[PDB]
Amino acid sequence: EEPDREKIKLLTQATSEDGTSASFQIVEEDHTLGNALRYVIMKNPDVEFCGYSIPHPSENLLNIRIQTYGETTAVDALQKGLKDLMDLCDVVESKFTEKIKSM
């Protein structure tokens, strides 16, 4: 129920104050979400740099760093990623259902 306070964390060591460079750490994730999320994030024209890195397979951790220019915030750019992934997966599900029905 509570807003998960430990899923995503903003690594102060890796975040600008002006507003366009952060490293986020998500627990219990890997390439599964990571590579898709960075892929959609790279579609954002305002992302300069984005990528994900696993500190260690055994640790079950995912760090994803987004540094942009002054035309977007890294939190905003990430939300743009997640809205794109949700809507895109809606597209996949919708066409898959349609072709399942067409048979």
Partner: protein
């Protein structure tokens, strides 16, 4: 410029074959990260229902208790995993297992001898009684609610013929397995698919045409039906590049390795999802894509912490 609607314009699905146990379908115009996301999730993250806690009361068989417990874990059950929620761990064993989160399977087999077969070994099944312990001997034991809920979906192993153990007269197996909801990532017994894999569509770029008996001689180098020749006096054509296996056998011959290129279609993905019976493979794919979406909703909803 890129938008999600230009993807929806560009994304395609083509379903070649939909069996109640296998689905072979294509995802055209997608990113490898997404096809691999669906594959990875279909394998590790899609929940399935499998035996987890086997409680033995007696095992006189020549098979090790632990081993038999693992084997009972491996048996896939024909259970719609949505009939049950997850079992927590923060709480005592008395609260862990309820009729909302656990399925009970009893196994009570006692091996005997039969009154005198014909010759002797006349196998095992005639010399002995209940000599073969199968997964079909896992009797489903409901509790209350789920007793009614399964009135029209009783619990059965998705393959009753699985041999679980072999006994001898006087040997006996009595155990009670607690089947829970789990994901294939935490242990491979919870993976609902046997094989969920993708392969890029092979592309056979013929750089210069081949004809006559060199064209048919090229045709026999590939799987029977990949390369078609209609006349061969003018071309040696590709009936279907999807039939090919990329054995790259054609490159063994200079007749071709300088007049053909073998590539792939980065956008076109050929998925093959075969189910272990717990669920139909397409329904498993639906759960995988709805799982990725649910994960993106979880990340939208979460507050960025610091």
């Amino acid at each position: 410029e890129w938008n999600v609607e230009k993807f929806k314009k560009d994304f395609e699905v083509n379903i070649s074959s939909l069996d109640a146990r296998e689905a072979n379908f294509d995802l055209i115009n997608i990113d490898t990260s997404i096809a691999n996301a669906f594959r990875r999730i279909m394998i590790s993250e899609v929940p399935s229902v499998a035996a987890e806690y086997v409680y033995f009361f007696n095992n006189t068989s020549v098979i090790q208790d632990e081993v038999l417990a693992h084997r009972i874990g491996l048996v896939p059950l024909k259970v719609d995993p949505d009939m049950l929620t997850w079992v927590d761990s923060n709480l005592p064993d008395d609260e862990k297992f309820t009729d909302e989160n656990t399925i009970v399977l009893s196994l009570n087999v006692k091996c005997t001898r039969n009154p005198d077969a014909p010759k002797g070994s006349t196998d095992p099944k005639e010399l002995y009684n209940n000599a073969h312990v199968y997964a079909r001997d896992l009797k489903f034991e409901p509790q209350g609610r789920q007793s009614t809920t399964f009135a029209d979906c009783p619990v059965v192993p998705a393959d009753p013929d699985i041999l679980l153990a072999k006994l001898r007269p006087g040997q006996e197996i009595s155990l009670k397995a607690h089947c829970i909801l789990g994901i294939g990532g935490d242990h491979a017994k919870f993976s609902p698919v046997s094989t969920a894999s993708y392969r890029l569509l092979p592309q056979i770029n013929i750089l210069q045409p081949i004809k006559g008996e060199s064209a048919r001689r090229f045709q026999k180098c590939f799987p029977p039906g990949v390369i078609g020749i209609d006349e061969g006096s003018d071309e040696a054509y590709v009936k279907d590049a999807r039939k090919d296996t990329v054995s790259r056998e054609v490159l063994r011959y200079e007749e071709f390795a300088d007049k053909v290129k073998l590539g792939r279609v980065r956008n076109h993905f050929i998925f093959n999802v075969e189910s272990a019976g717990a669920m139909t493979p397409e329904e498993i794919f639906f759960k995988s894509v709805r799982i990725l979406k649910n994960k993106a909703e979880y990340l939208k909803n979460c507050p960025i912490t610091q």
